[model samples]
Target: HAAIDQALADAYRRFTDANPASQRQFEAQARYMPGANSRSVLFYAPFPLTIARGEGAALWDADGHRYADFIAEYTAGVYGHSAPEIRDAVIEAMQGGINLTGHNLLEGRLARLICERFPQIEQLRFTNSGTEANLMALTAALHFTGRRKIVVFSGGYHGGVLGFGARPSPTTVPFDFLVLPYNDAQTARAQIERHGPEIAVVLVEPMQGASGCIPGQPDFLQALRESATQVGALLVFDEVMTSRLAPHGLANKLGIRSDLTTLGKYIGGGMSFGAFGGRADVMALFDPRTGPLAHSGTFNNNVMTMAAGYAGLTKLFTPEAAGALAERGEALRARLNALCANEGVAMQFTGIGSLMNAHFVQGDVRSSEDLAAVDGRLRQLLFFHLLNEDIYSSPRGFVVLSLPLTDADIDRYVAAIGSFIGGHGALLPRAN
Candidate 1:
């Protein structure tokens, strides 16, 4: 057998042997939950490692193994696990009240901070999750513009139900969605021009998150803004995962302004959170006193999340920290890419700032079509290899650094990658 295949087989055996407790738990829960988990993404081939607990940037699995958490809770754990500020805020909120009968000051304070931070959000509303935020944004757009069709790009993920890859997912909202290629400004323009009158919004991700962290070109995003304006349609930037790229969000960093922006992930300070806001005129559609569209969620104003999220933004992930963290991520990504180039590996890391995904492709990766050329098996193997090195990352090759990570942690991660390359150099294809 080939050396890489043999190594992978051995790794799988070791994984199963080491994770007997998780294996047993998986077997027991499989009868109730499909794949023995609620979130399908958590399920892996043999069985996913059951995390016992997380402290700082590290995770301890059920097998008693410690690993540096590179997943960062899919970019939502920006403050890392057990942040003191967030913990303190949560504790205080709990002691004060769980859910009050009327509104609380926490929500308004958090809202004001968010509005002041993001240039595009003049008015805002919260939701339970990013999925709900995207849905609410779309609904508001349709209502405000009095239009039916919404334009989205391939490889864009607004949420679970708003995914657009090669095609729309089964559970996607039944809105008239016009899907186009991402980062293809010309084609997008043509489509927008053709269907401009019917389109209510041109929804896009400043960076495609689930589809490999491919950044949207500035020109492409600017073109989207112009097209949406020409069509009198709202431009919605889904910064669910990308918001953490900067203190003011990726929109300000990229110099493109959207009419509506959907935000989530770390903005909730590691809680179940989502929010959408933009032009005051556009968001005014939800003004309750004016007999406008109604938007409501039971936990939208929950004291715990509002307080924790506010504390995280104001105290933990301040503007200075955001800037420094992004710089650190850029350096780490460049170092990883340099190592791959030196080793003649076919892998390349694509992303901006602290968010990145490693693709097993040879050339440029602009869209999901380019991502399709990636070697899924090789990527999966690399995931397990990293795990063996005590580095935890998303099995999908996604890596995100958090505040808990130090320069030494990054160096250790880089060295582990170096080791993997050295051992599997023969298996890795040369960059074209």
Candidate 2:
């Protein structure tokens, strides 16, 4: 552990030396916001890079250094920053006018496009962020089922308020959450049975994105679907991040459908957007002419997001485009894992499609418990070394490839990872 501490300190020193501009910003901004941040995910030790701007899978830091962006704004930048299509769409929307104070033409068109693409979504409604969509989704389920207990999986992140691993905080909502280990169908089914009739929804991520991209096994996910139905509970698939895995989603890939699905990130073409919809019966509750469930947000039908989201799906990211991106993602993940194996390092990237998280363990990562032996120092060293190689990824080791990220970009990324393994062999753990 002392050895790792020394290595991490060395990495931090190098990081500090390389990012003087960010250092200045961090110190000054801390006077206002604690740790100089509104967003916690953007913060990392030493100092996070102050990216001045981005254009087509590349970014420039405040220090005047350019790097190939790999995280793609945490999967929200599927089309990459400054994509002309999305930009033009937003600009055109702005020209037409901002918030018409009522229903807009773009919202219905975007909603139709999305519903047609994802079969599970019969009728959909939009929200500002995935968090809001999830909040509204769960609220609707609770109202529909008339159940108090909710089954949630460990490492599941539906939104800011609905986190299974989140600690007690004033921001956290008071939902009757029943947390169970992810990918444990047997245990989950038993619990569902025990809480039968009392459970309103079983919420889970098809792929746990924030918790290191650990995927949900089909058997486990299918089991949840079956049990939730048997108990009259809604199976809410939080595809906020995993929806990009395929043309439809992981559920469609697995040949199953859920009662409701929450979506966000990339669907709005790098704009602020989120949506939730499913079976007509459940989503029909949102109809003003129907039941007493009302979901309200000032920006829910914002013209900019509507226009941009519609443009991206229609013009840029077609079903065929999605197929190609997914192929590239699978290839890249395999290449990274292969390189780690060849180098004999205890490292792996667990994910599907273009979303992956680096881990300092070689074993399979089905759930958070599988990552028990993860060494923070190893993660730290890899991030800093990647920075040194002019690669921009999340400090948490999440990597999301954007549409603009070409073979050349991925080439340098894999190369940077190789250098990290070769240069920092002492700190890198070997498989036991």
Candidate 3:
């Protein structure tokens, strides 16, 4: 129980005493603000950390404790913070003015780079966030197919605002949405058989980032694609989190090119941006000049985000860079799994390429229900414990490694776990 006790003590001490003066200032400022929170999800039990600044793969909290950021600002810093290329690009673009009445060549350049990588991507449109990108994709699907329903997996989390949460049950309308168990080809087929005609799209995450980093099996994705094609429904792969993990995105890797694809996170560099692109004919629905779809955003492709995204993506696309990240990620995952084994713990690590998650659970996770069955409270405690140990990660248990993380840093991370978990495992329930 020493680990649990230490973790609890650390949490209390840090939450209460680390920045009493700054906490007071923040609380006082909250009076004029709604809930004193910028993002509801970012607001945790002890309140979110007031970040002073970030550089490379590290972030300094208001308390002045800098940590190796595995959270990586929601996987947006795969190129690391304030990367020189992105910084220079932003500076250069700003001198040209922030926004104008007409289009900028940067947008076209960025689009070309991304589209050329994925053969499925004949056209694309930019948005400010993954939420916007997903919303646009869903709307476009509905407009094109004249269908109202969408099919999403149980453990999938696409975008916060646009998609259904968790799985859609029998009580839920399949047309409004059908959320089937992931890797369940049979159930998906049954649902498609019953309601395929009315389903506009089957939206999926090649790797589910939110519920847990569970990658959809290649065969399952292929099955979904075939089913969607047969039913006249478009398959929408929400590759927002997995886009930068591999060279051609998860869809291309799996040999399943969705009818519509939404991308975010690392693709945006360290800035805020999201995009939706896919097969030319399907993407044509988003054409503002001729298509029936109405897409508009004031800050869409704003100079700064576009240039930063372009720079970040260009670096990612460089010769052997993606391969290097993948190799490093493999090493990181192997080390974590080894640590778990040495600690006498049963855990599961899921994901591919650079994005992955560690589930402190026995057996495999096949559905959101399985994920729900795990010790979530213990996971939260472990999250805070990791934070105290100078390793920052999402409370939901994911690690998005950056290209800048050296082998030594990864070794330090792996070494930190034995003591971190060994000290705390007894304080929580073991996987049952």
Q: What C-alpha lDDT values do all the predictions have?
A: 0.89, 0.88, 0.76
Q: What global local distance difference test value does model 1 have?
A: 0.89
Q: Lowest summed-lDDT stretch of 10 residues in model 2?
A: 163-172
All predictions: root-mean-square deviation over Cα?
Answer: 1.2, 1.3, 2.9
Which is superior by TM-score, 1 or 3? Answer: 1
Compared with the true structure, what per-residue lDDT tens digits does model 3 show for residues 311-404? 8767654526776787788878887876676566767567777777878776766656766656555666767777767887787777888877
Model number with the top lDDT? 1
Residue 320 CA error for candidate 3 (Å)? 3.0
Give per-residue CA lDDT, model 1, range 1-432, as digits (tens): 277677778878988988998898889989998888898678888789889999999999988899999989898998999899999999999999797956887899999999989978999999999999999999999999999999998878888888887788887878888989999999999999998899999999999999999999988999999999998999999998888888688889888989999999888888899999999998888888883799988888788889989999999898778888999999999999999988888888999999899888777888999977666668778888898899999889999999999888999889988998898877777786
lDDT of 2: 0.88
Return the TM-score for each candidate structure.
0.98, 0.98, 0.92
Per-residue alpha-carbon lDDT of candidate 2 for residues 284-343, written as tens digits (9 for 90 to 100): 888999678888889999999999999999998887788789899999999999998888
Report how far residue 85 has shifted in candidate 3, in Å: 1.1
Model 1 residue runs over 4 Å out of place are 1-6
